[PDB]
Subunit: 300 residues, 4 copies
Amino acid sequence: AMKRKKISVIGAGFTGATTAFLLAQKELGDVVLVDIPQLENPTKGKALDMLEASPVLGFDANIIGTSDYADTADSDIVVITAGIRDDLVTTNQKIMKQVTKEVVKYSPNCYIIVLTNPVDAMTYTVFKESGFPKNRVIGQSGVLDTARFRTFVAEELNISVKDVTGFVLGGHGDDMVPLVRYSYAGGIPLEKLIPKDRLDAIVERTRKGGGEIVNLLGNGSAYYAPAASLVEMVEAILKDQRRILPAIAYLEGEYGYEGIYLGVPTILGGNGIEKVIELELTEEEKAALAKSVESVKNVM
Amino acid sequence: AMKRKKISVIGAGFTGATTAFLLAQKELGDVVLVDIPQLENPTKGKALDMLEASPVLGFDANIIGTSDYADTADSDIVVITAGIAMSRDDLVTTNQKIMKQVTKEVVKYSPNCYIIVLTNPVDAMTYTVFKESGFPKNRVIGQSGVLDTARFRTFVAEELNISVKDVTGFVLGGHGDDMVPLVRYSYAGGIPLEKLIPKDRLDAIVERTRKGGGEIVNLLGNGSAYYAPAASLVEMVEAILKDQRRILPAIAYLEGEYGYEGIYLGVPTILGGNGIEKVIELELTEEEKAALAKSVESVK
Amino acid sequence: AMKRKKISVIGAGFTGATTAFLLAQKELGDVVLVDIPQLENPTKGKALDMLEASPVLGFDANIIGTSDYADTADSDIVVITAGIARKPGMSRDDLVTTNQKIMKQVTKEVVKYSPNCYIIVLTNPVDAMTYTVFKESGFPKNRVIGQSGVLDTARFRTFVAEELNISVKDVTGFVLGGHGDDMVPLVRYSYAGGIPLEKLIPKDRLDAIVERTRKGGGEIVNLLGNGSAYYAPAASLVEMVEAILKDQRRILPAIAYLEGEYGYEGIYLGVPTILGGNGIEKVIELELTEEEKAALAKSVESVKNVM
Amino acid sequence: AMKRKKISVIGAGFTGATTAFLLAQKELGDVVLVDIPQLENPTKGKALDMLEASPVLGFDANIIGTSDYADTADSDIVVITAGIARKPGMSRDDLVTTNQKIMKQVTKEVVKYSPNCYIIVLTNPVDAMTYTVFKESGFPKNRVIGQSGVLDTARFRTFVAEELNISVKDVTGFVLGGHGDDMVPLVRYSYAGGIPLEKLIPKDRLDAIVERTRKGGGEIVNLLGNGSAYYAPAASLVEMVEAILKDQRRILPAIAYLEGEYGYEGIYLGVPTILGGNGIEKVIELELTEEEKAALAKSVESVKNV
Ligand SMILES: NC(=O)c1ccc[n+]([C@@H]2O[C@H](COP(=O)([O-])OP(=O)(O)OC[C@H]3O[C@@H](n4cnc5c(N)ncnc54)[C@H](O)[C@@H]3O)[C@@H](O)[C@H]2O)c1
Ligand SMILES: NC(=O)c1ccc[n+]([C@@H]2O[C@H](COP(=O)([O-])OP(=O)(O)OC[C@H]3O[C@@H](n4cnc5c(N)ncnc54)[C@H](O)[C@@H]3O)[C@@H](O)[C@H]2O)c1
Ligand SMILES: NC(=O)c1ccc[n+]([C@@H]2O[C@H](COP(=O)([O-])OP(=O)(O)OC[C@H]3O[C@@H](n4cnc5c(N)ncnc54)[C@H](O)[C@@H]3O)[C@@H](O)[C@H]2O)c1
Ligand SMILES: NC(=O)c1ccc[n+]([C@@H]2O[C@H](COP(=O)([O-])OP(=O)(O)OC[C@H]3O[C@@H](n4cnc5c(N)ncnc54)[C@H](O)[C@@H]3O)[C@@H](O)[C@H]2O)c1
């Protein structure tokens, strides 16, 4: 029988909830929205509120809220947005291990997309607790950074964001390794369209993208763009699209590094990470990536 | 020259934010997201988060947060979510002045717009906006029945295990005990629900629709519903921006219809290019006629 | 190992090519467009043309054209649009004789390479042709389904939308039985915004609307001069394919095998169904008037000649 | 009153009908299919067939068929897909002559009933057909545009995606000038997820992809036996229509009137443009290698000699 895909969203906060509503509107499958027992009810009300939109927007998806991982059984994809500095890492690292053990009990065959910061190490933890091969455990970072990058380049030139491309290796902030030489408008290199000063500010504003939103909102981090980035990565897997997207992936040789997670260009498909793509980098880029890999080792 | 539609959403909270993002997703137009000067930053931060999701989801729309009503200039549509956050006469009276204040800058900066009001009690608020605006009846509308039908349809769909797409609901009047549902004009794929769902189980679905708001409030712990209410507003914006001539329930101004006059009541409407194109009058029975009188009398 | 749904469309004529392009645009799966060997090159031309549209419309679907049924192996759904139209002056029996044969030859190769698929049949007359597919396939009944009422209700909703000047989204039609004289409309289960149409449209013009619905297929044939309708038919097939692939449990009129329903046994009839992941989940049994039971008994007399 | 956008599609054939159906499905506006008086019943038949799909696919649109240009009044956009039925003994030069005459007759009737429209031309040869539409219309240059480059880039992107086994969403092509031998691809400005294709695909296979792109229209003609491509050309048209009606400011290749751009004056040429609510907002001018200037110079010597 034809069965709907099943997506469990672990963490029913701003990000997990926006992600669930997006997945449901796109009819990508049934969504189980999961939080802690003391937020069980709020999670049931967000779910039921999303579901009550379905007649009007006109989508067929079941959306339920729960604190019982038995309800995530035989999930196809699990999105870990479950969050609460070296103490924070150790708290989130404790969560990741509690969550992952429940997840792979009930869904031994699922694919895991991790949003939890620092996503470099939060994913490594999932990967090691899960016991799953590296293709099945992925983290989000590069898509959000390229999303902010394209938005700034788009207002600068007064053109559709659809015709802007960014390229990002590494993590957020100072871990971020932009390749503005692989960044284009209409396929024209940006370095030919934006004077040096205005362009390096757009690169800086991308580095300070996540904080610019944390500053404006006052309480909590971004959720709209981050939810979009997870959905693009979910869609790439469920629909076996073989998208080329930057993701947090486990290296076993690529770019010289081994045994770590890092933001690299991948092919996202029905087998999860089909390939980590190896580019020829400049010495300036390899050096900026070596510094980034030093802050990934910094969170052991 | 072809110009985008401009939509301004007054109230950048839970409901207006969700409304703005849905409108942008569907490329219905440009969105200005409007709150009060002390919240101008977290508003600009929601608007920018949303706009940053545009590259990832593939929509061309601009979204700006403001506290300056000059930015809402030449709006095609204004949507009022401006809500207060205390007696039952306190919220009404406070919301009434908000409505007045908001409508005043709106009809100065966008003289020719259409207005859709969500702020509860919508029958009272929509009246205020209508009075302060000096616009004809067709150009000022509240949201209520779409959200009630959406709840009804969700519960019927679960009861029958069928798609929400093939469930109809029919409601006059407003929320709570002011709701006048006609189950006899409600169907699963054109089949009346009286013939498909027993008397007892159909009575409880209707009671659950009366208490639908409250059920989310209770589960949410703090604050009311937004996903389904945002969805309900976008359906009404779409019917107007695209001149669809939908038959939708809407809070409209009566002048002979159902025997009442000089009130805003939940009625079936043709919603099109001229907002309310016609108020539809059915042949009501006495137990429904009386139920509407008790609904008219409860809106005072 | 998340893999695309695979949909095979049999017949690369206007209805099958239109269907293929809609399925690919909606990313419902990978599409295999099949036709006879002599039309192999045209079939690949159409498929490659549709596929070259994918970067522009921004869908990820494979489309291929073939005359090799091995290319349809392990289809989740197979849509049959192969067969001839009833030419003016052609007898109904000649239409059935020719299409009966194509349905046996097509089903043979379909089930040879996709023993587990769902089958949706467009070929006319659809109760007779869906029955032939069922009996040839050896499939259980929930897996072999014909299109009829969706297309009849689509034309009905279009005419009524025009008469009342409202969106088609807010019109409901309701039809049992087949096309033409075989259609059994329930105007009393037909509404505008849930208001009965008998209360809104006077008797003469509503009767005209019902009669135009019966004649709708012939109206497009008369206007085209060269063949039959394809856009609305293709749309109707895609709505049924979606209901199944995405397990939607839609309530849709379908041509379904009855085993007691409506008091008929061992026939395909046009009835309200719930459509989902297991195909026909349920035939919905209605209480009909005696006029309705009679019109349905005349409609039945045309799959009885195929039993 | 909020009013629907209105689109007239001149020629209700394979490309015209395919385009009309995509425009209605997407809800970009009401659609008027126009053809010759003898083909008015076929045109109403397609229009009515499409409209009867609306309740099933869930779109609200008016679609009609006509032989009468009054039904096209106050169109926001006219798409020209009109061209003469290729008879057996039709001279290449006879065909271009007939079509040149169709463009003038069509354009005179269009600008009388829609003096404010934006016009997109598909009819081959599109550089010469679009110039003929421009000069008959009396409109300024930003409001008469040709389709060519989008279709070539669609075919290129399809073949690169096949070659690398990746999504077509993540492949980009760059093409100046016309179809076939007149095409000037810039593979150096062509990528897979931002990566130059020259680093991904060996030169012999990438040369062959380019050659398949030049030949891509004829590849479909050969397989079909009668007639030419219609699904990708319709899609290509609709992307350009959508970039105008929704003021998107897309960067797309279009057959655009040049007054100095690339050092040419008073010609239509395939060039990267910005496409928005005022039609062609900007012709984009690239720094070309002497080889690319020379390939383009040779491409312009085609546009003048037809
Ligand atoms: N990858 C990125 O670029 C990116 C961007 C934005 C957000 N983030 C990160 O995503 C995380 C969540 O963001 P948010 O705004 O949605 O946060 P939030 O605090 O609003 O929501 C987090 C949720 O996690 C839940 N949770 C905690 N422990 C749990 C457990 N054991 N089981 C189940 N649920 C549990 C909480 O109940 C809470 O509702 C944060 O770590 C944030 O920094 C990363
Ligand atoms: N029709 C329905 O059934 C329905 C459903 C849910 C919400 N609502 C109503 O809609 C309103 C908004 O609800 P919410 O959940 O978005 O609440 P919210 O408090 O999150 O949003 C209200 C926002 O309005 C802003 N605001 C107040 N006065 C303003 C003014 N004069 N100008 C501009 N902004 C102003 C506030 O600062 C706040 O951000 C409330 O009245 C709520 O009860 C109606
Ligand atoms: N329910 C309705 O009202 C409705 C609507 C329109 C068409 N139809 C049915 O659909 C059929 C096709 O419609 P169309 O407009 O595409 O006609 P068409 O003539 O364009 O298409 C029929 C195709 O079937 C192919 N075919 C024949 N035998 C075959 C075989 N053994 N294997 C594979 N392909 C084979 C033909 O080569 C042709 O390409 C009609 O004959 C009719 O029975 C039903
Ligand atoms: N890249 C491109 O720009 C591109 C690609 C493919 C098609 N084309 C061209 O598009 C044109 C249409 O191709 P098609 O396959 O749709 O052809 P078609 O023969 O199917 O349709 C052309 C239609 O134009 C109609 N027509 C003829 N004269 C007319 C007039 N005076 N007024 C109105 N309508 C008139 C015809 O009756 C016919 O129905 C051809 O010139 C073709 O070469 C160009």
